[PDB]
Amino acid sequence: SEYSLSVAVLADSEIENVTQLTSVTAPTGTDNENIQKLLADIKSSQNTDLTVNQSSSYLAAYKSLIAGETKAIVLNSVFENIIELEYPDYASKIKKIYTKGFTKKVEAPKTSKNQSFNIYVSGIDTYGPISSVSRSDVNILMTVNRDTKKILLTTTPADAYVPIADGGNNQKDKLTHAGIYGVDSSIHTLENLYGVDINYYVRLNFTSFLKMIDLLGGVDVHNDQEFSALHGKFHFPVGNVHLDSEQALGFVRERYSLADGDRDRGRNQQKVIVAILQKLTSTEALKNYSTIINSLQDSIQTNVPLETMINLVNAQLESGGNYKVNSQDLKGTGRMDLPSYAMPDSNLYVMEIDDSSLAVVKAAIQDVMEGRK
Numbered sequence: 001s002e003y004s005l006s007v008a009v010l011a012d013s014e015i016e017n018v019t020q021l022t023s024v025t026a027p028t029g030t031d032n033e034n035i036q037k038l039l040a041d042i043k044s045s046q047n048t049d050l051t052v053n054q055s056s057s058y059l060a061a062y063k064s065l066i067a068g069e070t071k072a073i074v075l076n077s078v079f080e081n082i083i084e085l086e087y088p089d090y091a092s093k094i095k096k097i098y099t100k101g102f103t104k105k106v107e108a109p110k111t112s113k114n115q116s117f118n119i120y121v122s123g124i125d126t127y128g129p130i131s132s133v134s135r136s137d138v139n140i141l142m143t144v145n146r147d148t149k150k151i152l153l154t155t156t157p158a159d160a161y162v163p164i165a166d167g168g169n170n171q172k173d174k175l176t177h178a179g180i181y182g183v184d185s186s187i188h189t190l191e192n193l194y195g196v197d198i199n200y201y202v203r204l205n206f207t208s209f210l211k212m213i214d215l216l217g218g219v220d221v222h223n224d225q226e227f228s229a230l231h232g233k234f235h236f237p238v239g240n241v242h243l244d245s246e247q248a249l250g251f252v253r254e255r256y257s258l259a260d261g262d263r264d265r266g267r268n269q270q271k272v273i274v275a276i277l278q279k280l281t282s283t284e285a286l287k288n289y290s291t292i293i294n295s296l297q298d299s300i301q302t303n304v305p306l307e308t309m310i311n312l313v314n315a316q317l318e319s320g321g322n323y324k325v326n327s328q329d330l331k332g333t334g335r336m337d338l339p340s341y342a343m344p345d346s347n348l349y350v351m352e353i354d355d356s357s358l359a360v361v362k363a364a365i366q367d368v369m370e371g372r373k
């Protein structure tokens with residue numbers, strides 16, 4: 001993966017280059033490794049020593065820059081998308097006078113040592129190309145036991161107030177924000193929360209979802225409550241419903257009008273996962289899995305190795321047999337009085353986790369993995 005650290009000044013600054021500076025403001029408390037590599041690079045290429053004025057975060061550095069309290073900041077490009085949350089026009093306010101590119105070797109998928117594995121499904125709140133950055137409003141863990149032919153779907157509410165890994169600095173914030181830092185942040189956040197290994201991920205957005213449902217010929221679900229979606233464009237009666245791509249997207253997005261609100265939306269997403277799995281495990285879909293990869297690979301990101309896909313597909317082609325699917329959701333209490341790490345100046349709704357629910361959720365994941373009752 002690729003990111004950059006830059007030295008940024010205000011767009012209209014007289015400063016043109018780093019040799020004109022004596023100090024820079026940077027969050028060395030939380031991004032010190034990266035910051036020190038940038039400073040060493042500046043020393044190497046420009047023979048310029050800079051002292052650091054410590055900021056509490058990249059957001060804090062940005063605030064100091066626009067307040068005119070510092071002349072220059074360090075900016076790590078990952079954190080641009082976080083700054084954008086409180087300051088949507090930040091890009092127009094700054095210029096970059098020095099740039100250093102970075103690469104982080106990707107954390108490999110973990111092959112499970114037994115019959116079970118966990119796949120994390122991240123759904124990103126945007127249309128367009130898959131590289132588009134946004135929050136992850138779908139966060140479903142699929143625990144699959146190939147020996148017992150059981151799958152457990154664990155939904156964690158987008159607003160769940162949890163320690164956010166990596167860029168989140170292990171500070172509490174809504175889970176959906178982890179997806180802005182990147183899929184690694186989402187994965188490690190949920191690994192930490194549930195005490196489990198996540199073997200693989202799949203990341204997709206609105207446009208990805210539409211393409212996938214299109215390719216599979218729609219999906220079929222049993223709808224439990226009458227509702228409408230997308231400012232009344234679609235109406236879903238009680239009973240068996242076929243969903244084409246646009247209908248399915250409406251079906252998984254509506255929450256406010258549902259009897260159990262976001263929990264019912266989570267359940268509707270689980271129904272749609274089951275229906276997708278039913279299409280994906282048809283003899284035709286399995287035989288044609290390579291065409292499905294070819295058709296969706298530009299819009300769906302995953303670290304499931306090709307090798308593993310071939311094993312999963314062919315084992316299913318040989319054996320048949322459907323997976324029994326069960327579902328659960330992490331519960332808690334909605335509050336508007338708890339601080340957001342990413343958006344410290346905003347009052348956001350978050351869901352404070354219920355400890356007893358967390359214990360139950362963890363025990364159910366372990367039971368399915370171990371092939372227990």
Ligand SMILES: CC(C)=CCC/C(C)=C\CC/C(C)=C\CC/C(C)=C\CC/C(C)=C\CC/C(C)=C\CC/C(C)=C\CC/C(C)=C\COP(=O)(O)OP(=O)(O)O
Nearest residue numbers: 123124125137204205206209253269272276280281312316
């Ligand atoms: C068959 C095979 C491959 C193998 C054999 C089977 C086997 C042995 C195992 C199975 C496992 C494997 C390896 C593969 C199968 C593929 C799997 C596991 C899953 C497929 C399902 C999938 C990839 C996605 C479904 C995700 C889903 C339900 C929804 C995504 C919708 C999106 C992107 C966003 C919605 C965001 C929301 C809720 C609100 C924003 O919207 P809002 O309007 O509120 O906000 P605003 O827009 O206004 O801001």
